[PDB]
Design a binder for these strands. Sequence first.
RNA 1: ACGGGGCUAAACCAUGCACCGAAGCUGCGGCAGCGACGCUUAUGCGUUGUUGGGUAGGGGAGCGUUCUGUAAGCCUGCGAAGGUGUGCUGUGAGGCAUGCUGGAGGUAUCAGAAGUGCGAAUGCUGACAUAAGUAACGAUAAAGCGGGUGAAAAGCCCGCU
RNA 2: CCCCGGCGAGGGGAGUGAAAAAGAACCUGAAACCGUGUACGUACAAGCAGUGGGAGCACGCUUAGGCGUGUGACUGCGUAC
Lengths: 34, 56, 117, 142, 150, 110
Amino acid sequence: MENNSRTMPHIRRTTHIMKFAHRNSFDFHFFNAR
Amino acid sequence: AVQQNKPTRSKRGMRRSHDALTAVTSLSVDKTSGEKHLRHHITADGYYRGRKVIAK
Amino acid sequence: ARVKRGVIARARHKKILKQAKGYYGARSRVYRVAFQAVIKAGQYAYRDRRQRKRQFRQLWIARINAAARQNGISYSKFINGLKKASVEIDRKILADIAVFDKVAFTALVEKAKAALA
Amino acid sequence: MKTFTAKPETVKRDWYVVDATGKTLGRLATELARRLRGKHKAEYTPHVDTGDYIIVLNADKVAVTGNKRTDKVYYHHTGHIGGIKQATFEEMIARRPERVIEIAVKGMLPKGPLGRAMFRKLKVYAGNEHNHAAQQPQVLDI
Amino acid sequence: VTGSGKKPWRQKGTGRARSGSIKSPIWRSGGVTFAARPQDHSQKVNKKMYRGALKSILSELVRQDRLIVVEKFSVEAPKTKLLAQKLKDMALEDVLIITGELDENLFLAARNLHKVDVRDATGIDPVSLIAFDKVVMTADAVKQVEEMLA
Amino acid sequence: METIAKHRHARSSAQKVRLVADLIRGKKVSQALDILTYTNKKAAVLVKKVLESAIANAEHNDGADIDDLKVTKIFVDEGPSMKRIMPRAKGRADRILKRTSHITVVVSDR
RNA sequence: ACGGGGCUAAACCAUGCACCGAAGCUGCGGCAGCGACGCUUAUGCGUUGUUGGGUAGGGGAGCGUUCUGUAAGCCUGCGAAGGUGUGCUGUGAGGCAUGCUGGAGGUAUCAGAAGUGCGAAUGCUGACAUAAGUAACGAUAAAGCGGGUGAAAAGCCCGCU
RNA sequence: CCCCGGCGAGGGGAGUGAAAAAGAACCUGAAACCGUGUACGUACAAGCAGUGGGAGCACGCUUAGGCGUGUGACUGCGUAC
Ligand SMILES: NCCC[C@H](N)C(=O)O
Ligand SMILES: [K+]
Ligand SMILES: [K+]
Ligand SMILES: [K+]
Ligand SMILES: [K+]
Ligand SMILES: [K+]
Ligand SMILES: [K+]
Ligand SMILES: [K+]
Ligand SMILES: [K+]
Ligand SMILES: [Mg+2]
Ligand SMILES: [Mg+2]
Ligand SMILES: [Mg+2]
Ligand SMILES: [Mg+2]
Ligand SMILES: [Mg+2]
Ligand SMILES: [Mg+2]
Ligand SMILES: [Mg+2]
Ligand SMILES: [Mg+2]
Ligand SMILES: [Mg+2]
Ligand SMILES: [Mg+2]
Ligand SMILES: [Mg+2]
Ligand SMILES: [Mg+2]
Ligand SMILES: [Mg+2]
Ligand SMILES: [Mg+2]
Ligand SMILES: [Mg+2]
Ligand SMILES: [Mg+2]
Ligand SMILES: [Mg+2]
Ligand SMILES: [Mg+2]
Ligand SMILES: [Mg+2]
Ligand SMILES: [Mg+2]
Ligand SMILES: [Mg+2]
Ligand SMILES: [Mg+2]
Ligand SMILES: [Mg+2]
Ligand SMILES: [Mg+2]
Ligand SMILES: [Mg+2]
Ligand SMILES: [Mg+2]
Ligand SMILES: [Mg+2]
Ligand SMILES: [Mg+2]
Ligand SMILES: [Mg+2]
Ligand SMILES: [Mg+2]
Ligand SMILES: [Mg+2]
Ligand SMILES: [Mg+2]
Ligand SMILES: [Mg+2]
Ligand SMILES: [Mg+2]
Ligand SMILES: [Mg+2]
């Protein structure tokens, strides 16, 4: 958790924004190098 | 899609070379009031082409 | 004994940006780009102190070759004839006489033609 | 002392006329490239155009050796895909004969804004006639 | 530094340089990397090196004419005006006074003169023998330094 | 004699006012007032009140005459920006800049 | 599938003499390192030989910053520090002088002590850019006109639809 | 106190003060960044944007000339850290 953010004090868990595997439109067919 | 390099202040001023405003050249003089107005528009005191058109 | 860096670091940055005048864009304003450009301008200047001596001898030889062919001889026979006639004038002075005193250049060609014949 | 530099406002250029009848193409083109550059003058400066004006007459009667009249091929591309185009020496003579000498000299000139200004002093004509009698061109038997 | 040991954000994923502490010395309001403690700066001098240095300082004061030897150096009352008058009559202004054992009138009368130190022969030190212009010793104090310096 | 009027902390960006100030640069002030009247911009309302106040400054504090005046200098500078917070989707917060300007109009008969 | 133009030699083989060509060598001027011999040194100068690309790394010698002593000294309202130009100077880090700004501090020399030098660490904090006057202005239930107020009315008030 | 403005915001005078470019968004007031004015360059021209050479123009000097400053047509070499 990010507990003392000064630019965004309203949010503590922000990895649903910029991490591609944690976005709502991530599909597991993007991970096809298996 | 986003830039890979920051565009310069030179490139920004080149894009704005068509953003300049055109001044109105055409101010008519009403032939009984002497007031200036746009062409084919009424005057501020409500005249148009010599006569009182709006009684305002 | 706490040392603040404000005055010393400002004088060091201002010294680089004074040497970067006339450069384009961030190369004259921004220290990270200007410092990088002042070093490259010093490498070029060191290299071109050697290249300046190559380019002027290239220019003197091309001018000697043109004025010698006006008198009926090539460069390579005019140089060989002056070495055989014990003339020790260098290519800087020969290309200077070839422009400014054209009949003195004719005298050198006739000296070189006599030493070959 | 600094070495002399020719100044482009006080350079003297002169006018010459050359007859290309029976000349070898490349051996004529090398001499035209010297005089348009100004390599024959002692005032030669590598950044100044000190050359001469040359009129070339009878460009359709220039000569090549070997089998080059049917085998030398000129290529260009149009910028559209699949757009490579070719022409033999005999077709360039029949269609537009002045280009043969103009292409040969252009390859021997320097590349850049000064070499394009050296090319502008070359006047090539397919026949025996030019209309530059007011400039009084000197006959250059080269 | 005041503050908790909470990791400021998670290790991977947020697209930003990794953190472990708000008190890190890289950060504003963080700790000092090699923060200092109270320390003892005193050095050791050998006894023979200390006494050998005092003899060199005393020999230069004789050689450079900066040493003055007297029978008596006393004032009659504990008055600053008396000592300032007395030193004016010897052309001394910046001077260290070393005497046999210390007079109460002379100690009080010199307390307000900033150029004048008044000492007994026991409390001498190598820096004051160099810092003052002239050194005035009484004849009783001159003999006490020799027993001190063997 | 040169005469200044200024509007500091004018609520608009400098790029928008500079479009209107380039219309009247160098003009006689009677011609410049007519250009601003028939320009359909919010910045043309702002620049006209500074030009009108510079004309009144020059005849009251300097004793000049209105028929002689010209706009010799005009320039817009950037002022302080106000920082606002704009909510975006999924918990994102953006910063809004509310840009201000310093308008300077200069009149003189010479 | 000559770097290009072009070439029947401007190709290939053999012989020969010229010339071009490098930071190589030579010439002229300057600096430094290590040896050797000396106008004699007191550890510096003179003559001579030779050397001087450099990462990791080892050795040597310095510049500058804050603080303490020297300093109850020295500089300074006839203008300190700081800021911004210009000129001169050293092999370099640098130094010195001065115009303008500034309005009260600064500090030689020789020593002493270090929170002693920043472009990088998806460094930390603040300020300001770029994209860009671009996207968007949050339910497609919908507005039109007359009058009022006001510096200003598509949005407020009143009325009728 | 006077003037423009909406009995605004903001400004121009006047006055105080050694100083108001010390005016309350207040000592000093660097840099990034953004403008106005002036000199020169730039609309046939291809690339780490410099460096070596170099014409012309403008402003200073000072001379029986060719130096200083700014700009840099054209040209050799040159793929940031
Ligand atoms: N327990 C709910 C806390 C919500 C908080 N603002 C967060 O972003 O986690
Ligand atoms: K805590
Ligand atoms: K100063
Ligand atoms: K950084
Ligand atoms: K923008
Ligand atoms: K809507
Ligand atoms: K002030
Ligand atoms: K500034
Ligand atoms: K160049
Ligand atoms: Mg909340
Ligand atoms: Mg990233
Ligand atoms: Mg702290
Ligand atoms: Mg003991
Ligand atoms: Mg005292
Ligand atoms: Mg949204
Ligand atoms: Mg929410
Ligand atoms: Mg080749
Ligand atoms: Mg040779
Ligand atoms: Mg060489
Ligand atoms: Mg060499
Ligand atoms: Mg060598
Ligand atoms: Mg080495
Ligand atoms: Mg001190
Ligand atoms: Mg200081
Ligand atoms: Mg100064
Ligand atoms: Mg440090
Ligand atoms: Mg930094
Ligand atoms: Mg580094
Ligand atoms: Mg701040
Ligand atoms: Mg802040
Ligand atoms: Mg941004
Ligand atoms: Mg776009
Ligand atoms: Mg669009
Ligand atoms: Mg839209
Ligand atoms: Mg809505
Ligand atoms: Mg309606
Ligand atoms: Mg209505
Ligand atoms: Mg005063
Ligand atoms: Mg006043
Ligand atoms: Mg004060
Ligand atoms: Mg201030
Ligand atoms: Mg400022
Ligand atoms: Mg052009
Ligand atoms: Mg063309």
